[PDB]
Ligand binder design. Structure first.
Ligand SMILES: [Zn+2]
Lengths: 86, 144, 49, 148, 82, 144
């Protein structure tokens, strides 16, 4: 018996994976081309994607790159209340 | 051949598509491409957006009012946005002025109207006022 | 008379951008609507002034 | 002993038909709330563009209508009720037009509400009104229009 | 899909609800008999659901439905492919 | 039937009630209801109050002067305040425009003037220029 359910979003950012290598980007150069890779979601390069930051410019040359696979990362907390009788 | 472009000829069709609510894409000369739309809800009015890229989880189109003129619509090229292909990778686009030698080895100026290709990417051009095809090498771009 | 003496000019109205941070009450450094200024603008209108 | 019914000018409600008439080149007539009543035409010949004029009358041999280019707006057409020139005219400026709802005095000294469904004028210019729920025709002085 | 998840139980407690009104207990008297009732499920008077507490005093009132209450808070992350 | 409304027809009666000092209630169009009164004491002048609710230990009416015009009195609806019922719970109030089908299944517009009810709350309406009753379902509200 679920009584109350609330869903909350902690973070919302975009992470880019290479189709071939399967790694995540961690760093880029002056031209925004990749300098490094990392196989860790927590350390990967991130573009903020909360509502105020949509339609960015900093990573246009990155997004257009076909080898890269953008991924929308979302972190959530949900609260579930229960009643179990006597 | 390639069907990257499907221009609309009649404005009546454009208005009909606008009544259907589908987004349009209108070209500009030496200026940024634009998208056009009819507003939903009780009040119907034209809206515009300078955002071209596709709607996404990281990208949302921004719409605002404008007093668009039919003169731009009737004159400029118009397309359905979703059906549009960003580019056709050829040396000389359509409506591009080139200099060519006619069949009798006399040189004339012309503009290009054709899209044909084999399965390897070799392209051919047919000139306005002409019938046969012309290669990428044969044509020469006419400087402004 | 105004059209006779005036000069052709573009006119755009002003409105506070949504990008204003709700807590500090101050704007994002760079967004398409306003490029660091705390105020956005509407599409231009033509006028003589 | 009266003139045949006189038709009211129908405002065009849908944008699609208005553009269709405009593409054919049939003249439109637009009323602007702020500034004026104007005609709209798409240019003849191959050099296509929209034109506007304020010469509000039938093109008499001694009355040449003059046109100037203007960038007409879509929203202007939508918000402002528009007519076809061939209908909108001084031929009828009836006080209560067709489809208007009015309050009319009945024989039983009761004021009932009814809609005007047909309009015709006698030779003296008095407009005869046909009303829903009534057989005979009614006169302008007898009627009352309730607004809001 | 789910990349990482964990469930932690913040609280386990017993809450008191009236059998007649159905309103939960908000405040009580000197001997834990009710003086105020409230409709709120969560603001309701609550105590830890441990055996020792029961031996330390359900006991006091008759119009009394001693209900158990548990809170689950869940931390999760997703990688939603394109 | 219900007697929630007892409108006054003659202004002479209104003045007579005002001389008696009883409070009035005057309706307004798209505006707040008002109460009117004659001042006591040596000087007699009209007073008004925007407070509608009944006088109480927690609620006291506030009165002020005003140069009221007879034109409002003679035109607008007027009632004795204490005798007034706040509302009559029906779908379409009196003087509300509705569309109805006449006996010959031809549709005409009308305004409502009737208050009748059984003891269960089922209501019936008689239209201006009409005799028989019309149900809540039969009538259709005419949009402004
Ligand atoms: Zn901003």
């Amino acid at each position: 018996s679920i009584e109350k359910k609330e869903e909350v979003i902690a973070h919302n950012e975009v992470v880019f994976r290479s189709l071939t290598q399967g790694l995540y980007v961690k760093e880029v150069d002056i031209y925004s081309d990749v300098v490094s890779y990392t196989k860790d979601v927590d350390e990967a390069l991130a573009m903020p994607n909360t509502i105020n930051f949509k339609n960015s410019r900093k990573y246009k040359k990155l997004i257009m790159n076909l080898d890269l696979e953008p991924l929308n990362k979302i972190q959530k907390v949900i609260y579930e209340t229960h009643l179990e009788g006597l | 051949p390639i069907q990257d472009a499907k221009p609309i000829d009649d404005i009546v069709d454009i208005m009909t598509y606008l009544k259907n609510g589908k987004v349009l894409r209108v070209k500009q000369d030496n200026q940024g491409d634009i998208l056009v739309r009819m507003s939903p809800g009780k009040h119907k009015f034209t809206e515009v957006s300078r955002d071209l890229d596709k709607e996404s989880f990281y990208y949302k189109r921004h719409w605002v009012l404008y007093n668009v003129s039919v003169n731009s619509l009737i004159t400029f090229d118009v397309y359905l946005d979703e059906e549009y292909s960003e580019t056709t990778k050829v040396k000389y686009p359509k409506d591009t002025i080139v200099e060519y030698t006619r069949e009798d080895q006399e040189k004339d100026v012309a503009m290009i109207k054709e899209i044909l290709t084999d399965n390897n990417g070799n392209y051919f051009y047919a000139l306005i006022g002409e019938t046969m095809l012309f290669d990428e090498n044969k044509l020469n771009k006419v400087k402004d | 008379f105004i059209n006779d003496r005036g000069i052709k000019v573009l006119w755009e109205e002003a409105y506070f951008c949504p990008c204003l941070n709700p807590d500090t009450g101050h704007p994002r450094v760079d967004c398409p609507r306003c490029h660091g200024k705390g105020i956005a603008y509407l599409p231009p209108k033509e006028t003589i002034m």
